[PDB]
Design a binder for this molecule. Structure first.
Ligand SMILES: CC(=O)N[C@H]1[C@H](O[C@H]2[C@@H](O)[C@@H](CO)O[C@@H](O[C@H]3[C@H](O)[C@@H](O)[C@@H](O)O[C@@H]3CO)[C@@H]2O)O[C@H](CO)[C@@H](O[C@@H]2O[C@@H](C)[C@@H](O)[C@@H](O)[C@@H]2O)[C@@H]1O[C@@H]1O[C@H](CO)[C@H](O)[C@H](O)[C@H]1O[C@@H]1O[C@@H](C)[C@@H](O)[C@@H](O)[C@@H]1O
Lengths: 424, 114
């Protein structure tokens, strides 16, 4: 126990320095200036921002996960999770085997846990996949840009075979959508905003030219318009994507190519990958908590100068709480960003989870194409710039070294003032 | 979760020094590492940093003169200092980025006049 302040500051002199600054408006204002500049580094920059790189990493991990395993994931049936006697249902722009389509055509077996994924769940997954791949390709906005949108996310699937009812679409009023040439408007709520969808149906007969299936089919085209592309929005689509896999927990059996890196175990249930899916869920959760600080930083602008009569840290210090909230929010953003990297960075991983990441998720088998590109060799590899993103996260963090100090200092000056400011 | 810096002391202007930091793997593994310094009268200043692949970057106050480096096999961080000036007088500390919130003892570096 120290009786008085001189003994205390002889010892911890950096503290003496801190008190000197906390009583000096020009220092306090220079810190406030910095909080502004770093704030812009996080929530306004993109490539230079740990925060941004972390959000991108989380999303990419989720997408990558599905690129790696979705060709192997079995699926089928008819609507409402029912088995089918003879229903092939094909989803376009998916990382299928030697293909840019995944075919869901497993009959008789009952969709569910340790079974095929229902077409109902596949549809849900697919939407998120298409949205995310499109956003990734367009490029993600800086964190502050929470009012942007993707002009057009479009995808189709086709239905064929006896009794296949997956392409019958029921509407908001109740009437069935006209199977041949019909066209209509869903809306839904993504994020907190309303998004028009144009659903359109189309029948193609077996005789008709270029029908490479030689069987009469129904094609459903979904055209979404003005889809929000904020972090908060896309994280939510990732969340859907991964949770839909985890919840449906379908059966998967990979064809392990010789020479390559080796999948373990070779067949099973997708929610079996518990380490990987936890990581991906945690990453998304941390990134959401990361993007939440954006609203705390905005709510406490630090531009207005502080300072008439000489400055009095005991009474002139209302701004302090705001400053502290802001600095603490920035430091949380940084730490959460770091943490997102650490969850997946294979430098810290062991055994089967590490090999998933180095062997499969981190890799790509196209020849590098822009983000969001599905190709006929996309499957069995992440194809989502994980390794690059982990690297760019680090690079961004390393170029944040100064700012991080400034944040800490601001936080500490603010704290000192709140502290003096109490008493009253 | 440990940080230990060494390799400092008293040198002459233009002199050169090699600082070492032995870091725990919890700190070091798969992390950006970096060098920090605290001068009398002032607060901890960031000096340099290096990613796990080995890409370094430096504060404008030392660019050209200092060189950061890491030995991934042995959890070791090095700052190679050249053309030292009296302004570089400080305690030098090593940490990951973003920082583990308990710091090392540091290692004193003093530049003088001849
Ligand atoms: C089941 C189906 O897809 N039926 C189509 C039909 O297609 C023919 C064609 O593919 C030939 C060529 O080989 O094979 C037929 O089945 C064979 C079978 O394979 C044989 O082994 C043996 O049993 O004989 C039969 C043939 O006798 C296919 O059936 O083509 C017609 C004309 O285009 C489709 O009908 C049109 O579309 C529907 C929606 C209606 O609007 C009709 O008026 C149109 O003429 C026909 O589809 C089915 O049509 C009936 C009409 O009774 C129902 O309306 C039903 O739901 C339709 O099936 C749905 O839509 C089609 C496009 C497909 O995607 C199915 O998966 C889906 O359930």
């Amino acid at each position: 126990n120290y009786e008085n302040l001189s003994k205390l500051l002889t010892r911890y002199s950096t503290l003496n320095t801190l008190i000197k600054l906390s009583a000096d408006p020009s220092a306090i204002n220079a810190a406030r200036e910095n909080l502004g500049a770093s704030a812009k580094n996080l929530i306004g920059d993109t490539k230079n921002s740990p925060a941004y790189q972390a959000v991108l990493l989380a999303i990419n991990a989720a997408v990558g996960f599905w690129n790696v395993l979705g060709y192997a994931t079995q699926c089928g049936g008819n609507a409402n999770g029912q088995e089918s006697t003879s229903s092939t249902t094909i989803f376009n722009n998916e990382p299928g085997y030697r293909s840019t389509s995944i075919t869901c055509s497993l009959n008789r077996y009952k969709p569910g846990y340790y079974g095929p994924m229902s077409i109902e769940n596949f549809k849900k997954l697919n939407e998120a996949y298409q949205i995310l791949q499109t956003a990734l390709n367009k490029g993600l906005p800086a964190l502050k840009e929470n009012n942007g949108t993707i002009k057009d996310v479009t995808y189709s699937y086709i239905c064929y075979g006896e009794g296949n009812n997956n392409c019958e679409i029921k509407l908001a009023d109740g009437q069935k959508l006209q199977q041949n040439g019909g066209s209509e408007t869903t809306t839904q709520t993504i994020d907190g905003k309303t998004v028009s969808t144009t659903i359109s149906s189309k029948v193609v007969d077996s005789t008709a030219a270029d029908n490479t299936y030689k069987q009469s089919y129904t094609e459903i085209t979904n055209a979404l318009k003005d889809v929000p592309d904020s972090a908060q929005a896309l994280l939510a689509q990732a969340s859907t994507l991964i949770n839909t896999i985890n919840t449906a927990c379908p059966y998967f059996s990979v064809t392990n190519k010789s020479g390559g890196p080796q999948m373990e175990p070779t067949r099973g249930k997708l929610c079996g990958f518990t380490e990987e899916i936890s990581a991906i869920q945690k990453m998304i959760t941390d990134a959401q908590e990361l993007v939440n600080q954006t609203s705390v930083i905005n709510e406490h602008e630090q531009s207005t100068p502080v300072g008439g009569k000489p400055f009095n840290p005991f009474t002139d210090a209302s701004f302090a709480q705001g400053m502290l909230a802001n600095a603490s929010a920035q430091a949380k953003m940084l730490n959460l960003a770091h943490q997102v990297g650490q969850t997946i960075n294979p430098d810290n991983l062991t055994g089967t989870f590490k090999n998933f990441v180095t062997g499969f998720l981190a890799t790509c088998n196209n020849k590098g194409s822009p983000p969001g590109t599905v190709t006929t060799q996309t499957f069995a590899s992440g194809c989502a710039y994980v390794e690059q993103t982990i690297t760019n996260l680090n690079n961004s963090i390393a170029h944040f070294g100064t700012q991080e100090q400034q944040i800490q200092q601001a936080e500490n000056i603010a704290d000192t003032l709140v502290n003096f400011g109490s008493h009253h | 979760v440990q940080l230990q810096e060494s390799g400092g002391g008293l040198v002459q202007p233009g002199g050169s020094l090699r600082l070492s930091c032995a870091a725990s793997g919890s700190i070091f593994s798969g992390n950006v590492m970096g060098w920090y310094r605290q001068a009398p009268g002032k607060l901890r200043e960031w000096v340099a940093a290096i990613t796990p692949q080995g890409v370094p970057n430096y504060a404008d106050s030392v660019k050209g003169r200092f060189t950061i480096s890491r030995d991934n096999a042995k959890n070791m961080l090095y700052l190679q200092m050249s053309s030292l000036k009296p302004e570089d007088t400080a305690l030098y500390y090593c940490n990951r980025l973003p920082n583990y919130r308990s710091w090392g003892q540091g290692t004193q570096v003093t530049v003088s006049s001849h």
